[PDB]
Symmetry: D2
Subunit: 208 residues, 4 copies
């Protein structure tokens, strides 16, 4: 079995993206006989699709877990649904702010994630990790990647399982916000890393 994990580079004026470190830390690990591949994606429309599709064809994973930063969110969230729409609340990293366009013209309006989301959530809770089901991944780069990955699955027959995990800010990202107004929630890096490993294990369990 092959597992792909993706993360994103820094965006939105942030110095770091904890998911870039998660992808790098998960690259090369094994869970049983399963090999994990971790790759970092650009927060850039068009370019993220090219990198994603190249990566999928290269690796042909059985399971793809895509990870993103969700600023302001207080627990791990497991995305249920990917939507065939872009409406960027902020520009991508190249200043491209796409509004009310499909991701893939003519493709289904949405795809459900094919990860065992409820079992993933249950297992995180057992591990002491706050987690819930999210019903919108936004309409920016996280959703864009989530949708393209599920579309690839529906269209190519691989990955068999695909979904998205959003993570809170890590505490060090909060320091800079304190002298500026409201203080967003955060979660320690080590818990976020473990919260990505858990979906892989649960997914590998459920597959075959």
């Amino acid at each position: 079995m092959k597992v792909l994990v993706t993360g994103f580079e820094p965006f939105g004026g942030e110095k770091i993206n904890p998911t870039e470190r998660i992808a790098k830390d998960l690259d090369g690990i094994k869970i049983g006989d399963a090999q994990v591949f971790g790759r970092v994606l650009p927060v850039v429309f068009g370019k993220a699709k090219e990198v994603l599709e190249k990566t999928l064809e290269e690796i042909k994973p059985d399971i793809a877990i895509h990870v993103g930063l969700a600023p302001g969110r207080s627990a791990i969230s497991i995305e249920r649904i990917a939507v065939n729409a872009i409406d960027a609340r902020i520009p991508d990293n190249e200043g491209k702010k796409i509004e009310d366009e499909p991701i893939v013209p003519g493709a289904p309006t949405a795809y459900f994630s094919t990860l065992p989301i409820k079992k993933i959530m249950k297992k995180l809770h057992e591990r002491g990790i706050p987690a819930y089901i999210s019903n919108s991944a936004g309409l920016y780069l996280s959703n864009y990647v989530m949708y393209l990955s599920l579309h690839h699955s529906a269209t190519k027959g691989y990955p068999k399982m695909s979904g998205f995990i959003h993570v809170p800010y890590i505490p060090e990202q909060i320091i800079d916000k304190i002298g500026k107004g409201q203080v967003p929630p955060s979660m320690s890096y080590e818990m976020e890393l473990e919260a990505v490993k858990v979906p892989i294990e649960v997914a590998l369990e459920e597959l075959l």
Copy 2:
């Protein structure tokens, strides 16, 4: 030197109080030259006061750092002000819900914390711990203890430094709250423990 650290027991139907664990962990340890004593206070009006005065008179600490749970808070908070009032939003652990009463009749309306609060915050930031200055400790058991402590100092000439640190929920407290609606912020236990050791260090440094 002697440092008192108090925590509180569980309250409001919570299974746990992280500050109880913190007091018990810091108990008996030494930070530089100073001995640290860790005591757990009851979340009970009257009783907490008796326990607190007995503990202060017994130990005669140079520094008192009082620690409480602040549900819904997303970073470490350092209390600036203790207020001469009780207005309980919920009953204490014996079912007493005291409304509109002084803590100490005739005593001042408020006392400023005598911890070096801004230096504590600066040190917490450079250690990667999100922290801010809170201007109200509530009017339940946290503020009661914070007021009685600072009053004891002004009245008896010790501790020379006294103050209050509120901590968020730890991740494991969040798990049961997921099925039931909104999802409070949390902070790892390890980070909260370090965030109380730091106030001791900088307080010890600012004294003599």
Copy 3:
């Protein structure tokens, strides 16, 4: 031209549902030459569907605006997407808590709202009414009804336009909640009523 507006009965232990009162205030009114029909729906899976579909066939509206209460939301929200799923966070008004079930087996995973959502938002703004686009209607009764309505449109060819508006609590609903901590946003009833009329006006203008 014929417009159906729906609201919901009280639920989740609430004494009132401001959308029940909105639907009653709009029932029988005319917007220019357009006849409006207001109907209150039960917060009951199954029964809501029977009532909705019967009402749709009875009236055959050109435009359907479905309105629901969204506790904790601070502005008017216009729903972009309906999702083919039920995952009830609380039971419905007959105690039914349905989890991870399709609304219509074999139908599209999602439908986009066919209201002119951006022109509605723009119009509300210039009317001084805070409004935004929501990308999830939840997976309870609002989404259920939103989906069934858009399904009827795609499948029967009427309504021509269909969509969903969520409203905050109205200020009176906040009174009893002030004791128990969290103080939710609200919006005056009059503004909420005006914010439902605006979609009718914009939809009518965009049709033919």
Copy 4:
């Protein structure tokens, strides 16, 4: 009887301050036999004290209700306590940013509001207006004015009743913030105006 109501000018990038309109709308009215004076204060340290102390001396009111904007707050808030401290999170309207300074060196650490805060809150509730007691007025211009007014009371014997009321944004202030992402709570201007009249009414009734 004579009644002083103050509000503030716009600050912090905001086009309007609703408390400015409130003060101007209340000026010159009578509540029963009592005469209401409405004054707009500058959001400027030093100048606001000069203006406040001059107006208090000129009018010598029996009751002083000071009103201000609290961005982010979801209901009316009646301030319990003013504190003898300035710790400005943002500069004032003249670019001055005071950090960790007392308001009146020598004066008490805090004064309690001498408005019948609990009766005001009870009456606001019966009127369908959400309201709660706040235990911190911040440490910017609202608290500065709250403190100086109560200090004036204790020091000169007038005003006999002094206190502070904070109001949420009004809905028209929210519109430009929807692009910016997050969407703060608001309250209708009409409800906010009514909500400062009630304090005048219950305070007059309290004073003989």
